[PDB]
Amino acid sequence: KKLMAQIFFGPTYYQRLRHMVDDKIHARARGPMQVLTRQPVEGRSRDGG
Amino acid sequence: NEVFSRPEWMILTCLPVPPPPVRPSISFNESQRGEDDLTFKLADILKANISLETLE
DNA sequence: AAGTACTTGA
RNA sequence: CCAGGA
DNA sequence: TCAAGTACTTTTTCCGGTC
């Protein structure tokens, strides 16, 4: 069915940026701990909490 | 306070030595140390003390 | 950048 | 530190 | 004695590289 509205449609130059979900997503539930403080390690990289 | 903090105790005679859990070594590979700064600074205190002790 | 704390000259 | 993200 | 100078203190949201 026709839309009651008319859509502004045409080509536009879009860029793909360096931020992708899969390089961001992270989850932890017990993992590596620091030596000194005996607390969870830092960063996604290190499987930190 | 006569029990917990006499002013004479602001001056150090007998220095407490913290145990390894406070100053752990970063034990890289097998035969390689990696001693904490506190372990180094303590040896500096030890060394300074022996010089003075022998001197007097 | 804005304070306490202490020191210095009139 | 350096570079970046909300 | 009391203005003005001095020292020295203090902070600032959360989340890769190359060293």
Give a structural overview.
The structure is cut from a larger assembly and holds chains A (49 residues) and B (56 residues). Chain A has 49 residues and is mostly loops. Chain A has no helix or strand. Chain A is elongated, with a radius of gyration of 22 Å. The termini of chain A are far apart. Chain B is mostly helical and 56 residues long. Chain B is built from 1 helix and no strands. The chains hardly touch. The structure holds 3 DNA and RNA strands. Chain B: Residues 24-36 are annotated as: Lid loop. Chain B: It is found in: Nucleus. Chain B: Belongs to the RNA polymerase beta' chain family.
Give the SSE layout.
The structure is cut from a larger assembly and holds chains A (49 residues) and B (56 residues).
Chain A: no helix or strand
Chain B: H1 37-55
Chain A binds three DNA and RNA strands through residues 18-19, 23-24, 43-45.
Subunit structure (chain A): Component of the RNA polymerase II (Pol II) complex consisting of 12 subunits.
Protein name (chain A): DNA-directed RNA polymerase II subunit RPB2
Organism (chain A): Saccharomyces cerevisiae (strain ATCC 204508 / S288c)
Separate helix tally of chain B: 1
Q: Which structural category fits the helices and strands of chain B?
A: mainly alpha
Instruction: Write down the overall geometry of chain A.
Output: elongated
- Give the oligomeric state: part of a larger assembly
What is the count of β-strands of chain A?
A: 0
Tell me the β content of chain A.
Answer: under 5%
Order of helices and strands of chain B: H
User: N-to-C terminal Cα separation of chain B, in Å?
Assistant: 34 Å
User: Per DSSP, what share of the residues of chain B sits in E-state strands of 2 or more residues?
Assistant: under 5%
Rg value of chain A: 22 Å
Largest sheet of chain A: none
Give the CA-CA distance, first to last residue of chain A: 50 Å
Helix content of chain A: under 10%
Sum up the overall morphology of chain B in one term.
flat
The largest pleated sheet of chain B is described as: none
SS-based class of chain A:
little secondary structure
DSSP E strands of chain B, number: 0
Helix content of chain B: 25-40%
- Count every helix of chain A, treating DSSP H or I runs of 4 or more residues as helices: 0
Radius of gyration of chain B: 16 Å
Region (Lid loop) (chain B): 24-36
Protein name (chain B): DNA-directed RNA polymerase II subunit RPB1
Family (chain B): Belongs to the RNA polymerase beta' chain family.
Subcellular location (chain B): Nucleus
